[PDB]
């Protein structure tokens, strides 16, 4: 059947501040099929234990999830999205920028 | 509150 | 102002790997209230919002009781589309439907929806009457007739007119502090130099809900929609939305361009621009 491949946003909730926690996001939509794997990484390690919202869907079909965790943004610490999906042929990593 | 609709299949 | 219920499943076959997955949401606009999964180790239709957990167990049992049943009939139409399609029993396949309710201010029906897909095309729709239907394909035709002769739509007409708008009704009325708020974004502007020649101006809205919002940048007073970049409305976590959009634009032009902000929060459309 035909497929469509995540777009994928990383941001965080609140604006970025060094040493004041927050929550980091990895938005993935506009998919199909549902399947989809999604690690957030921190200095290129997987973060354990993060969340992630009840799949649904948009009105053409595509899906959605919000992937997340609490985190303390440094100068120092970069942090990432993992995104998989059978469109891909491997996995695609997008960093996380203050500014986007 | 969902919709219950028994015994409708495509 | 104007509201609406949706719910939302998902039924995922697998072959091999058991029977098919059964993922269910239900929404007031922007706002998830119950979820079902029939993965969870104790499959319920669970809270997701403050203002659903005052149901008492009778509503939680019947909501459980018709998802369980619900799970069984997309089981049974994966069964059916892989006759419908002449499809092999070794892929995996997904049926998704949405149905629900749009109400006006008074609280009377606007209209209502059902309409679901296969494989992430449409497959069969009610019409806007809540009396005929739209397949999109020879097999949804098939499916069509069999509902036609059963007299499906005036059934789903008696939900979408009657137990959809009260249902929604009541839970406007118990989740009024947060369904009937509208946060307005914040706003701003944010410049960054690409090279000595150009810059992009992006503009920011935070904060806001519900999700519906309109930026657009404008230069010398009008639209660039052709060259400006748009990112999807994005949830926050913490029930807002956030979005932003960006021009690049020629060094000393900045001041020709103006971002324009509406969402229903705001009385007046906002106009905003860099601010050095």
């Known amino acids: 059947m035909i497929q469509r491949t995540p777009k994928i946003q990383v941001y965080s909730r609140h604006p970025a501040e060094n040493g004041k926690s927050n929550f980091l996001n990895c938005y993935v939509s506009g998919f199909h099929p549902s399947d989809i794997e999604v690690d957030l990484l921190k200095n290129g390690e997987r973060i354990e234990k993060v969340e992630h919202s009840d799949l649904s869907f948009s009105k053409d079909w595509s899906f959605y999830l919000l992937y997340y965790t609490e985190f303390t943004p440094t100068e120092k610490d970069e942090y990432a999205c993992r995104v998989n999906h059978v469109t891909l042929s491997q996995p695609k990593i997008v960093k996380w920028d203050r500014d986007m | 509150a969902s919709l219950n609709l028994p015994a409708v299949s495509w | ?276």
């Open chain 3, 1 to 276: 102002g104007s509201h609406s219920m949706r719910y939302f499943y998902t039924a995922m076959s697998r072959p091999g790997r058991g029977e098919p997955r059964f993922i269910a949401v239900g929404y007031v606009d922007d706002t998830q209230f119950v979820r079902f999964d029939s993965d969870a180790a104790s499959p319920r239709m669970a809270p997701r919002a403050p203002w659903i957990e005052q149901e008492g167990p009778e509503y939680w049992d019947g909501e459980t009781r018709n998802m369980k049943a619900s799970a069984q009939t997309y089981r049974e139409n994966l069964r059916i589309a892989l006759r419908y399609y002449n499809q092999s029993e070794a892929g995996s396949h997904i049926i998704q439907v949405m149905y629900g309710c749009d109400v006006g201010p008074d609280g009377r029906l606007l209209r209502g929806h059902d309409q679901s897909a296969y494989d992430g095309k449409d497959y069969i729709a009610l019409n806007e009457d809540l009396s005929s239907w739209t397949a999109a394909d020879t097999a949804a035709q098939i499916t069509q007739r069999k509902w036609e002769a059963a007299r499906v739509a005036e059934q789903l007409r008696a939900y979408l007119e009657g137990l959809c708008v009260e249902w929604l009704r009541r839970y406007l009325e118990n989740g009024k502090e947060t369904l009937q708020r509208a946060d307005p974004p914040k706003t701003h502007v944010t410049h960054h130099p690409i090279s000595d020649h150009e810059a992009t101006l992006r503009c920011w809205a935070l904060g806001f809900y519900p999700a519906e919002i309109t930026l657009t940048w404008q230069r010398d007073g009008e639209d660039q929609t052709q060259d400006t970049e748009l990112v999807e409305t994005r949830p926050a976590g913490d029930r807002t939305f956030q979005k932003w959009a960006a021009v690049v634009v020629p060094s000393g032009e900045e001041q020709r361009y103006t971002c324009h902000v509406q969402h229903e929060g705001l009385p007046k459309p906002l106009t905003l621009r860099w601010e050095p």
